[PDB]
Amino acid sequence: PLPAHDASKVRASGPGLNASGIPASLPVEFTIDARDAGEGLLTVQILDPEGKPKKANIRDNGDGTYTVSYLPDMSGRYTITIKYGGDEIPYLPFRIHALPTGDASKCLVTVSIGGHGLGACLGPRIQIGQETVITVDAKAAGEGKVTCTVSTPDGAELDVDVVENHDGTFDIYYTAPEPGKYVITIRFGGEHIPNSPFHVLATE
Amino acid sequence: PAHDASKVRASGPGLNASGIPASLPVEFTIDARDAGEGLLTVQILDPEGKPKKANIRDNGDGTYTVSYLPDMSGRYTITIKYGGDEIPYLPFRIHALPTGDASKCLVTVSIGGHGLGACLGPRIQIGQETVITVDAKAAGEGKVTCTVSTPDGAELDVDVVENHDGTFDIYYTAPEPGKYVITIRFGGEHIPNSPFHVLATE
C-alpha cells in the first residue's frame, strides 16, 4: 500500500466504546476518526462474549470519519479490534461490557403460522418453507429488547431482525429453508428467555 | 413387644445396585420375619433431596412390599427403619437411569375441549380441568411423569394415564389461585418447555 498512513493517529470514541458499559439488546454506534492518519483501509473485528465474530457495520462519512454500529445481543464483554492500513490502532483491544437489563424470565412465547395460532410456546418441530411467526411477549419483562439468532443445519449463525411492536411484544419472522436441526436463541435484555436456546427440528 | 432391626433383610428391583430405569414404578421387599414386632418406615429422598412417596403395603406375614416412582433421573437415598431403629447398611443409594429421548415429546393442552396449542399458556382458571397430552411415540423407551408445585410450596405427584399408543394424558385442576410449576418428564428428563410456569387466577 504505497499510500501513506499512520494508524497510531486514529482515534475512536462514542457510546459503543463506553468504558462504563452499555445496555445489552440495544444497537449502539461509535465514531472512528482517521482525519490525521493518512489513507488506508479501515477494518473492525468484534468478538462477542462467547468469542464468536460479530458484524461491525461501517459507514464511511466521506470526511475522514467513520460510524461503526453493532448489536450487543448478549450480556458480557465484547472485544473490538480496529486496524487502519492493516496496522492496529493504539490501546487495543477495546473491552466493552454489555450489561443485562429487565427480567427475561417474564417473557412469554406464542407461535403462529399462516395467521393461525399454535398457542403458547415453541415446540420441538417447525415446518419447512412456511413463514413462522414467533411472538415474544415482554410486557412484564421491564427494560430491554428481544433479540434472536438462528443456527442452521449447516452450522451458520445468523442474526434475525426482530420487529418491535411498541406494545411490549416482539415478532420474529423465520422461514426454515431446509429440513434439519436449527437452534433458535431468543434473548431479552441480554439474557435467554425461558427455554432458550430452542433446539428445533425442521420437518416436511 | 421386642424387635431387632439388625435382622431385617431388604431386596428387590427397587434396590438394584446396577440402577433402575427412570419414570417406571418399582417395588422392593422388606423381610422382617426374624425381627420381631414393630412399625416399618421408609424415607426416600429424590436427587434434589426432597421427599419421595414410599407406599408401604403390610403383607400381614412379616414382610412388606414398598413401591415408589423415580420420576427424575439421578440418585435416590432410601432409609428404612423398624420399630424406630435403622436396619443395617443404610442408606441405600439407587441410581434411576435416563431412558429414551424426552426431547422428541410433543405436548398439546386442552381446556374445556378447546386446544391451547403447545404448553399451558401463562394463565389458567382455578377449578377448571386441564388436559395435557404428551405424544411420546418418537421418544423410545420410558413413560411420562408429572409433578406439580403449588403456590404453598408443596409438591404433588400427578398420575399420568398411559394410552398404550405412545401418548399419555394428564388431568389436573388448580384448586387455589397463585403460581404453579408443572414439571413433565419422560424417561427421567424434562420434555420440551418443561417445567411449565402458570398463574392460576379466578
Side-chain angles (χ1 to χ4, degrees), chain A residues 108-109 118-125 194-195 198 201, chain B residues 103 105-106 116-122 192-194 196:
Chain A
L108 311 163
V109 171
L118 321 185
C121 298
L122 177 66
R125 283 154 91 90
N195 309 125
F198 297 85
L201 186 74
Chain B
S103 73
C105 285
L106 293 325
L116 274 43
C119 94
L120 274 284
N193 294 306
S194 170
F196 295 77

Side-chain angles (χ1 to χ4, degrees), chain B residues 50-150:
Chain B
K50 84 168 91 63
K52 179 92 263 132
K53 191 193 246 165
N55 298 297
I56 303 166
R57 199 185 65 219
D58 187 337
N59 298 317
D61 61 2
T63 79
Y64 302 80
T65 304
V66 185
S67 60
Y68 69 101
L69 177 56
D71 60 326
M72 169 172 2
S73 86
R75 297 156 185 84
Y76 290 72
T77 305
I78 306 183
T79 304
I80 298 153
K81 301 169 179 175
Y82 195 67
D85 308 308
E86 282 199 308
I87 74 177
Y89 310 166
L90 290 183
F92 291 106
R93 311 288 197 163
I94 314 304
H95 253 273
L97 307 175
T99 69
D101 189 355
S103 73
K104 302 294 154 243
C105 285
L106 293 325
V107 176
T108 64
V109 174
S110 170
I111 293 179
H114 165 168
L116 274 43
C119 94
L120 274 284
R123 291 169 127 111
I124 61 200
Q125 261 153 36
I126 62 175
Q128 171 96 326
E129 301 91 353
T130 78
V131 185
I132 300 166
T133 301
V134 182
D135 176 347
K137 316 195 170 145
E141 277 338 277
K143 306 293 196 223
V144 172
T145 61
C146 177
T147 59
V148 179
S149 305
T150 52

Side-chain angles (χ1 to χ4, degrees), chain A residues 86-160:
Chain A
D87 305 307
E88 282 170 39
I89 72 175
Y91 314 145
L92 291 183
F94 284 93
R95 288 278 289 184
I96 312 300
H97 201 167
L99 306 166
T101 68
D103 188 354
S105 74
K106 301 297 158 257
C107 289
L108 311 163
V109 171
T110 53
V111 176
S112 69
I113 295 180
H116 300 282
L118 321 185
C121 298
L122 177 66
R125 283 154 91 90
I126 68 197
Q127 188 172 356
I128 308 144
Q130 291 234 285
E131 189 161 71
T132 296
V133 186
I134 302 163
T135 301
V136 184
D137 174 344
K139 298 165 154 143
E143 178 193 359
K145 306 294 180 80
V146 173
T147 63
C148 178
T149 294
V150 177
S151 314
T152 51
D154 64 19
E157 290 219 40
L158 79 97
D159 287 13
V160 180

